[PDB]
């Protein structure tokens, strides 16, 4: 009543979830740091992490795009 393919897929996606959760938390903390101490330097890090996640497919590329756009809007408004 069980399939080796299904079991192996579960065992793989556990590790994949761990790694992807780590990356997403890193992105969250970087964007939070940017918003906390707004500075044009942190926007670059936000860009890098969002783009890397969007390529890897962990995050939706359109969400990465909207994050970039809204952070740039905040920066342009403040400067």
**Is residue 76 involved in binding RNA (CB under 7 A)?**
yes
Can you tell me the distance from the alpha carbon of 43 to that of 47, in angstroms, rounded to the nearest whole number? 6
- Residue 79 within binding range of RNA, rule CB under 7 A: no
Pair 66, 53: CB distance under 8 Å: no
**Segment 8 to 37, residues that bind RNA, using CB under 7 A:** 8-17, 19-21, 23
Helices 61-78/4-36 angle, 10° precision: 0
* Binding site residues, RNA, CB under 7 A: 1-17, 19-21, 23, 43-44, 47-48, 51-52, 55-58, 60-63, 65-70, 72-73, 76
């Amino acid at each position: 009543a069980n399939i080796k393919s299904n079991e192996k897929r579960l065992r793989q996606n556990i590790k994949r979830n761990l790694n992807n959760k780590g990356q997403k938390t890193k992105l969250k903390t970087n964007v939070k740091n940017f918003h906390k101490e707004i500075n044009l330097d942190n926007l670059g890090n936000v860009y890098s992490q969002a783009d890397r996640l969007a390529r890897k497919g962990i995050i939706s590329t359109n969400r990465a795009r909207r994050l970039k756009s809204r952070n740039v809007a905040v920066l342009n408004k403040t400067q």
